[PDB]
Design a protein around this nucleic acid. Structure first.
Length: 351
RNA sequence: AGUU
């Protein structure tokens, strides 16, 4: 009994949806806002610089913090993501880590192992973005350490979006928690659903297309990481012509109802979630011809690194345009997601 | 498949 039967929304999610929206945020939003900046992070950054510099003498070293804590959707149990730039690699793109990058990460491992200030949790060199997971013992904060600047770049984009249009931030906190209660996080990450929220609000004219923030003319040049444009015009929404909403409980509830209803009925077979273009009905069959000329040139030289479109669910990263962030979602995982969306939208209704 |  599979495709003809709806996957039942888990009880742990149902209780939270049917419970008042207020109790969702009463603690979670103020906590998430406070975790954007705490002094603990300066201790981590300084300790990490002190730890690793002797391992890379005569090379510049800068640490960049990113991820959910930094954008404003974290909680006390969230990891802190850290990009360690040794030797000015910020503007270098590696879809999969180079051997040189792996050798650098390998060399970093023994420092965390040897240092009493850090507990090594895992060393993941075979991931697309290899990482060292380690606990910073003085603060107790778990850190994911990588050698790839792109997550930092999209964090700064999210931070601008969230600060300009706080509704986005409230919605992301809600759907992050919904994913956890639905036990969907193995298939759909917090970052993936953040891009889905962004795209949904773009369709409502509440957020700009990312492409529109990256016009290349006399006033505005690109910051490039490989072929990707990672900066954006930090224009006020007043200049952009976009209204800025106060997120209230009824406002949030109404947008979340429409969010879940929209992704319950989205045609994942023919369309992709596309915060770069930020318009309705962006066709899987067309997207590769809609990107900037650097994309086509990049795939010409990296033919196995074009966006993976032959997948049940396509959500394109707005900066790293060759990345379908949901490429690992299975047909049954997508069916589960859409069913959960459908049931959540129903429970958020008030006829 | 593992950060975002």
């Amino acid at each position: 009994h599979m495709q003809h039967i709806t996957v039942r929304l888990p009880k742990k999610a149902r209780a939270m949806i049917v419970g008042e929206i207020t109790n969702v945020f009463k603690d979670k939003y103020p906590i998430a806002d406070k975790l954007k900046v705490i002094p603990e992070y300066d201790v981590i950054e300084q300790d990490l610089c002190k730890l690793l510099s002797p391992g890379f003498p005569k090379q510049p070293l800068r640490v960049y913090k990113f991820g959910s804590r930094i954008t404003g959707i974290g909680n006390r149990s969230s990891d802190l993501d850290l990009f360690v730039d040794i030797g000015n690699t910020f503007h270098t793109f590696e879809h999969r880590a180079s051997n040189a990058t792996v050798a650098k990460l390998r060399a970093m491992r023994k420092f965390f192992c040897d240092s009493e200030d850090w507990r090594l949790i895992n060393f993941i060199e075979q991931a697309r973005v290899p990482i060292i997971k380690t606990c910073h013992l003085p603060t107790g904060i778990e850190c994911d350490i990588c050698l790839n600047s792109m997550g930092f770049c999209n964090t700064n984009l999210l931070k601008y979006i969230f600060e300009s249009q706080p509704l986005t931030q409230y919605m992301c906190i809600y759907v992050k928690n919904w994913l956890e209660r639905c036990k969907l996080t193995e298939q759909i990450s917090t970052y993936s659903i953040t891009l889905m929220v962004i795209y949904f609000l773009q369709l409502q004219a509440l957020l700009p297309p990312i492409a529109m923030l990256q016009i290349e003319d006399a006033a505005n040049q690109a910051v490039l990481v490989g072929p990707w444009v990672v900066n954006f015009a930090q224009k006020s929404f007043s200049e952009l012509g976009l209204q800025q909403l106060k997120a209230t409980v009824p406002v949030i509830k109404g947008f979340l109802r429409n969010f879940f209803a929209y992704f319950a009925k989205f045609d994942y077979e023919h369309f992709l979630v596309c915060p770069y273009i930020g318009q309705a009905n962006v066709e899987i069959a067309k997207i590769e011809r809609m990107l900037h000329a650097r994309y086509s040139a990049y795939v010409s030289d990296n033919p196995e690194c074009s966006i993976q479109l032959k997948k049940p669910m396509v959500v394109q990263d707005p900066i790293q345009l060759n990345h379908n962030v949901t490429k690992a979602v299975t047909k049954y995982g997508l069916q589960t997601f859409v069913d959960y969306c459908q049931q959540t939208a129903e429970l958020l209704e008030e006829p």
